[PDB]
Amino acid sequence: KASLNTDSFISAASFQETTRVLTEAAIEGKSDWLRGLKENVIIGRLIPA
Amino acid sequence: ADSGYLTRRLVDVSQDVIVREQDCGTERSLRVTAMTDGDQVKISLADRL
Amino acid sequence: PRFDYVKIAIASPERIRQWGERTLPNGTVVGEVTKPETINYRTLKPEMDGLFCEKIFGPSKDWECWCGKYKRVRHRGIVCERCGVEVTESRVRRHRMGYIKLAAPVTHVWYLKGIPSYLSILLDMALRDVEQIVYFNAYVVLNPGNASNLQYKQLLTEDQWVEIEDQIELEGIEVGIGAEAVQRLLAELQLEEVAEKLREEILASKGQKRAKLIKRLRVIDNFIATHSQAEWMTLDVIPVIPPDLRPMVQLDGGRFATSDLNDLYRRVINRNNRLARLQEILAPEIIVRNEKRMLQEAVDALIDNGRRGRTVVGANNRALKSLSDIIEGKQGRFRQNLLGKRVDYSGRSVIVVGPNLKIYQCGLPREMAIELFQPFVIHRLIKLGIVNNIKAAKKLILKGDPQIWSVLEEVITGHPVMLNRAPTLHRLGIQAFEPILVEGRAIQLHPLVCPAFNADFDGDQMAVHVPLSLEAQCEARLLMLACHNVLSPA
Amino acid sequence: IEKFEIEARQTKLGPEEITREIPNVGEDALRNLDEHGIIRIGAWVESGDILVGKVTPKGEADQPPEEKLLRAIFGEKARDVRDNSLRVPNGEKGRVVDVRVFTREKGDELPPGANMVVRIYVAQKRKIQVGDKMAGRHGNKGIISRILPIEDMPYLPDGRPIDIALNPLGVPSRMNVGQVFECLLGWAGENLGVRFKITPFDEMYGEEASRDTVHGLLEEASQRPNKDWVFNENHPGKIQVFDGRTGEPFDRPITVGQAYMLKLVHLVDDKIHARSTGPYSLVTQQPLGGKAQQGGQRFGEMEVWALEAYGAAYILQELLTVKSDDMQGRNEALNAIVKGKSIPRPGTPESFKVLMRELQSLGLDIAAHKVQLSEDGESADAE
Amino acid sequence: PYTEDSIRIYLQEIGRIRLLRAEEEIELARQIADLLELELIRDNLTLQLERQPSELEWGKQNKNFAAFRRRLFLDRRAKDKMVQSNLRLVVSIAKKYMNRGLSFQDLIQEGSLGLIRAAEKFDHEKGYKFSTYATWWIRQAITRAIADQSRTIRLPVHLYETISRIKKTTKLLSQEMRRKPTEEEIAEKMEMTIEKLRFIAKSAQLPISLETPIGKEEDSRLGDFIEADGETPEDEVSKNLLREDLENVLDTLSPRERDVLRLRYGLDDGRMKTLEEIGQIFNVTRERIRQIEAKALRKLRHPNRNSILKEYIR
DNA sequence: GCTTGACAAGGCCCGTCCGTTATGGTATAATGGAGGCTGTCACGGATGCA
DNA sequence: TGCATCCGTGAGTCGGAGGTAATAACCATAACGGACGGGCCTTGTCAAGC
RNA sequence: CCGA
Ligand SMILES: Nc1ccn([C@@H]2O[C@H](COP(=O)(O)OP(=O)(O)OP(=O)(O)O)[C@@H](O)[C@H]2O)c(=O)n1
Ligand SMILES: [Mg+2]
Ligand SMILES: [Mg+2]
Numbered sequence A: 001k002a003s004l005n006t007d008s009f010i011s012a013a014s015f016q017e018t019t020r021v022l023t024e025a026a027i028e029g030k031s032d033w034l035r036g037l038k039e040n041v042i043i044g045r046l047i048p049a
Numbered sequence B: 001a002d003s004g005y006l007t008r009r010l011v012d013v014s015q016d017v018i019v020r021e022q023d024c025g026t027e028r029s030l031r032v033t034a035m036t037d038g039d040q041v042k043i044s045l046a047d048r049l
Numbered sequence C: 001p002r003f004d005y006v007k008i009a010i011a012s013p014e015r016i017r018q019w020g021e022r023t024l025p026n027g028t029v030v031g032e033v034t035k036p037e038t039i040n041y042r043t044l045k046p047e048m049d050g051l052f053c054e055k056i057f058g059p060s061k062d063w064e065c066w067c068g069k070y071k072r073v074r075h076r077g078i079v080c081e082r083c084g085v086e087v088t089e090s091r092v093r094r095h096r097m098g099y100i101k102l103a104a105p106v107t108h109v110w111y112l113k114g115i116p117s118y119l120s121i122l123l124d125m126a127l128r129d130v131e132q133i134v135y136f137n138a139y140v141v142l143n144p145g146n147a148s149n150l151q152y153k154q155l156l157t158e159d160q161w162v163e164i165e166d167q168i169e170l171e172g173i174e175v176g177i178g179a180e181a182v183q184r185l186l187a188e189l190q191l192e193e194v195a196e197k198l199r200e201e202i203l204a205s206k207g208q209k210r211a212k213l214i215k216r217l218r219v220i221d222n223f224i225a226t227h228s229q230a231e232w233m234t235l236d237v238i239p240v241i242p243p244d245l246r247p248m249v250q251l252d253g254g255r256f257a258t259s260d261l262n263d264l265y266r267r268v269i270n271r272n273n274r275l276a277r278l279q280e281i282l283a284p285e286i287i288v289r290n291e292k293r294m295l296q297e298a299v300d301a302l303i304d305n306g307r308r309g310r311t312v313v314g315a316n317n318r319a320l321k322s323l324s325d326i327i328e329g330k331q332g333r334f335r336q337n338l339l340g341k342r343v344d345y346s347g348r349s350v351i352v353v354g355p356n357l358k359i360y361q362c363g364l365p366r367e368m369a370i371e372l373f374q375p376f377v378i379h380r381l382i383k384l385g386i387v388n389n390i391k392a393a394k395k396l397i398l399k400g401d402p403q404i405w406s407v408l409e410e411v412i413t414g415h416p417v418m419l420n421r422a423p424t425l426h427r428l429g430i431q432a433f434e435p436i437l438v439e440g441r442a443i444q445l446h447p448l449v450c451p452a453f454n455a456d457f458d459g460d461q462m463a464v465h466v467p468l469s470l471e472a473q474c475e476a477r478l479l480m481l482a483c484h485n486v487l488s489p490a
Numbered sequence D: 001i002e003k004f005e006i007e008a009r010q011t012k013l014g015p016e017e018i019t020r021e022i023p024n025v026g027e028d029a030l031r032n033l034d035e036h037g038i039i040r041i042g043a044w045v046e047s048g049d050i051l052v053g054k055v056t057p058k059g060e061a062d063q064p065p066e067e068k069l070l071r072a073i074f075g076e077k078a079r080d081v082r083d084n085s086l087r088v089p090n091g092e093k094g095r096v097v098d099v100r101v102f103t104r105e106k107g108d109e110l111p112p113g114a115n116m117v118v119r120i121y122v123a124q125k126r127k128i129q130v131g132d133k134m135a136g137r138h139g140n141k142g143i144i145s146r147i148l149p150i151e152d153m154p155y156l157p158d159g160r161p162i163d164i165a166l167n168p169l170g171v172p173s174r175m176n177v178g179q180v181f182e183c184l185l186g187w188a189g190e191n192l193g194v195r196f197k198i199t200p201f202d203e204m205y206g207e208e209a210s211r212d213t214v215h216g217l218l219e220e221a222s223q224r225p226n227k228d229w230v231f232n233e234n235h236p237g238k239i240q241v242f243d244g245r246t247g248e249p250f251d252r253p254i255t256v257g258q259a260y261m262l263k264l265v266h267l268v269d270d271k272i273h274a275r276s277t278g279p280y281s282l283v284t285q286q287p288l289g290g291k292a293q294q295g296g297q298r299f300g301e302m303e304v305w306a307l308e309a310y311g312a313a314y315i316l317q318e319l320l321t322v323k324s325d326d327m328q329g330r331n332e333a334l335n336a337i338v339k340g341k342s343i344p345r346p347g348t349p350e351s352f353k354v355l356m357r358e359l360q361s362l363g364l365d366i367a368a369h370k371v372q373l374s375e376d377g378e379s380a381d382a383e
Numbered sequence E: 001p002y003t004e005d006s007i008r009i010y011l012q013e014i015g016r017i018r019l020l021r022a023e024e025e026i027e028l029a030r031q032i033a034d035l036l037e038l039e040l041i042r043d044n045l046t047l048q049l050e051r052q053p054s055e056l057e058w059g060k061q062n063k064n065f066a067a068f069r070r071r072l073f074l075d076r077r078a079k080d081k082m083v084q085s086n087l088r089l090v091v092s093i094a095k096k097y098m099n100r101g102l103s104f105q106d107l108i109q110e111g112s113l114g115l116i117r118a119a120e121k122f123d124h125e126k127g128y129k130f131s132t133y134a135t136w137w138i139r140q141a142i143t144r145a146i147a148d149q150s151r152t153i154r155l156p157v158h159l160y161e162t163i164s165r166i167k168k169t170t171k172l173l174s175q176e177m178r179r180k181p182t183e184e185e186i187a188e189k190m191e192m193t194i195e196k197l198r199f200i201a202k203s204a205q206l207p208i209s210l211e212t213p214i215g216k217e218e219d220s221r222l223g224d225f226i227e228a229d230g231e232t233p234e235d236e237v238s239k240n241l242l243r244e245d246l247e248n249v250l251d252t253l254s255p256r257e258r259d260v261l262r263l264r265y266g267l268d269d270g271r272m273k274t275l276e277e278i279g280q281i282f283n284v285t286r287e288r289i290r291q292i293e294a295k296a297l298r299k300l301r302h303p304n305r306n307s308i309l310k311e312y313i314r
Numbered sequence F: 001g002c003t004t005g006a007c008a009a010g011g012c013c014c015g016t017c018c019g020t021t022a023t024g025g026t027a028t029a030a031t032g033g034a035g036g037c038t039g040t041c042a043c044g045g046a047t048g049c050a
Numbered sequence G: 001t002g003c004a005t006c007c008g009t010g011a012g013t014c015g016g017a018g019g020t021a022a023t024a025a026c027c028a029t030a031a032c033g034g035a036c037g038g039g040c041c042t043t044g045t046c047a048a049g050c
Numbered sequence H: 001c002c003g004a
């Protein structure tokens, strides 16, 4: 539950329950400011660690 | 499969814990005693410090 | 390019049409897919209006029109006046997308049959009732005016509606069915009025009612902050994925290899065209009503197969892979292609014991090493003046020469090499080594790094990876070299 | 014995033909081929040798300016066919033993769309090798890691060297004690010449029946008039072993015997594999998988976690971009390594754009934005 | 009760309507003929009055327009009743065509379109019942929907009839000649070319999905073995080094012939030009241009100081 | 350093020509569908019912 | 309002090999379109001349 | 189906 209640919808969608996370993220209209290891791997950038 | 699923959940719950700053400036502390189950110890205090 | 954040929202019909529409210099938009044809059977060319169309998605070959007459490279940025295909490079079929204009409104299955089913939350109805209205099994009252037995958003059967037609009451009573009724119910919902009514209703209410009011209010407050309309959960325009992401290739033997997305789009287009044909010739309502329900079930199977009703299957009763099925699982896009990839400049072999060999050193086989370090050998063979290009270098590499082995010995000196054994349970499962060229076919491993890999010599194989950049070689040496990894991290 | 098969298919641009005249192939690469372009029985083939020469009529003829100028200078008439010959894979040397050819007008009938089918059988004798798997009948597997000369192997007090040294620590941890019973009984039968046969669960005939049988047969083998070094009553299963390099005996007596060892199908030639650059996948544009298609190793999620637990942000970035599904980065990295310059900075990987288009086709308005000097703008990742 | 079977829901919805009798069919056919001749005179009025016939009618030539609307409503209701009452015949016919490529509901809807055509083409002055002519048109629409849909790379109708004729001819010539089947006599009895017969047999194949598993497990997939058809990075770097060596070789000779050879083959413009348009880049005409490029090729074909480019010979 | 004239070669381009392809039709009477599950386990919401 | 029933969600990582699907009308008639053949022009070599 |  703490993995799915994070501020980033990309990490929560890549972890588990992609349909529900993407539905609540699309209705809430939220942004992903790319703060973490898992998002920069998907994007293709240098990880911030 | 149970072991690997637990490992993947533990990775996803804490993939954003990076050491960012040098000091936070807090006064709160954690009390450490020797772990004992009965009369004999399991981990001593010197190993826990 | 660089970007700072990624934002997700609900797509409006004008935005979906904005992704698909492209204008021509003659003054004509080309973005709509109207026929379910893919390619011609005689010549293997895409049809002029369909799921692979070159006017919508781009040319299949580099700098070549569909009908001919523009085969050269010199016509750049031009559109053929006879056919309509822009003379561009053929990699725009990865990016250019189209759309399908529906004849009836349809509901998105993510917003209806999910949990907590935001459509029934915003409509303040039960999920079974909205699911009965959408799939044409019950009516709903849109105008309850001049009646005591009828009220707003009340469901009726067909018998209850034909017995209401006894009274012809004596006023204008409207009903609705399908996603038109849901779109009309969502279009007349005043968001600020329902929000202030819910805020005036929470302070004086019961316990278990208050949680439902909080859930509806927090759903409604998202639609005012995002400035998105509630009727955008019903689709009028369907986006079409680019054709190179649903490829249709030919196997050696004449059979074509297709993807499962083409059958779903073909069903959507077929039922849409039949619905337009039935509405044109004024068919009876039991036939037009079954055609709208079938189009509704066709759009749902394209988005999420088997979410609501029967799973659409293929040839051997295998379920077709849908737009959420290609991303949602451990075989999807995230876990198979984004968080882990297959890489170049890599290999594997069985491992043997390496005594009379130091730590930080691995025994790398020679025929494995000419393949992994091939561009570094090719660079050295030209720098030494032996050959002059890549073709002579590749010819001398494959033909076998004693010069190549001295070149490879002086190339791999000081170039660290990462070794990996699966499963990688902790950090010490990937370590860097300085290779020495051994003769044979197995990789020689030092016996002290064997508990770090959990590796014995009874059948284990290890993968080998070569860093290319200079920052990647300085990181393998200063951070990952095996003579600095004595202590456990746990 | 390996088996290779090639089909002369029917293409729309023309029929594929099996011929001896192959473009860009030299003089002595055709000695083993017959008049039809097929190898003969009894020829030696190695990796890269032509088994069946085949051509197909390519017909696009879209040449770049470099090839056009190079064929303007040096003659160089470009032919209408291209090379499609059947070749030996990497390794797989051997002798050709069966070159049976099937043609539809000979009486055969083929898969549809194929003119003729050639089947080639290549046989090879494989000796024992470093990296091969070896096992006994008691679950004691192992990999050969060193092949020693017999003057370096340890030897017996009759001068006979040892064929194989097994580690004694693999016995009591794995708890397979019957291999020592088997080796001692086989060595008694070697010194007697009798070829014993013992059914399992032989402790029904008494207590310590296997031990008493083994040591009694070792005593009776040691009662031969010339072989009394075979059994020692002070230490039963062990005798004295000398070192082949120094001549000194080892300090403790060593269990010797005759074991029945096996050679398994897991040989190192079928396990070694390496890739520089090969084919790629259809949609994701990532390297393929498999030995048969020159595929790359999968750098899975646990390996990404292992690289993230280190520092190594640049190793992880080049593993995800310039080694997979970033085509401009692939070309730029190969050109920078060949010309000896610095590898440039990579771009957006190809599979992320595929995910963006898929999420847009699901009906989600997902986009990347960029902020710069009080301004928000939607970025174009397809470029 | 609640169910998710749309076929069961549709079968209940068509079971709610009763079946007709024969005098009902005669009266509905009379009203349908009245509707169709009214639509014929409406169509010729639209062809004459430029498609503004919504307020025009020849059935009268205030209460007369109400009677005309009532007549049109009863004739349209008669047509809809004759279509709706016979939907059980569509389900009884379309349950035979089940596994050819369409689902059951698509066959039902296309047979319903055929029933609409049969109801608008029926003649009650022949004595025959509606069910025979309806069965003909329903089977026509179902087979036409099979031949038009249910295949990704679709085949025309004459190809399907040629495949059926080839099946019948091969089975008859196999009944005649029991052993040694002969494609030469198959092409003889069909009077067609043998490579045309191979083309028909090649186009008659069915596609296979890229998501089919290869083994008896879920570890493999057909798309995992298909290589993308593109150009390798090795070919890209080889042609880029060839371009750089080519430009470095060409800039050693005279500056005029270098740009003549560059504009001739598109090494700077990306456009191969003719000999005259070089004469419009300059003003000296195209006869000197051919001699210039000839002597430039002769200078680049020298054996000395030109063998750096001779290694790219394949 | 170019220039004019002869000798052909080959893309555009507009006619027929025949093979392919789209479309319409057939009149005894026919009037509600085959076709598999039936041996996993555990947790969390969401109904639903007394 | 508490307890029973229901449904959706998850269930370790790499490598090799083999390998898929699998049955079902027919006929006239006009519209369509690729192929093939002359016309004119544009283009690419030989050849003599200042 | 097998190997780690
Ligand atoms: N389903 C499996 C089986 C094995 N392994 C890996 O393969 C190794 C198997 O070791 P192996 O040599 O097969 O057996 P040992 O544990 O060494 O025992 P023994 O010496 O008796 O064979 C394990 O450590 C484990 O990391 C795995 O990841 N998943
Ligand atoms: Mg092991
Ligand atoms: Mg082991």
Ligand SMILES: [Zn+2]
Binding pocket: C065, C066, C067, C068, C069, C070, C080, C081, C082, C083, C084, C085
């Ligand atoms: Zn064109």
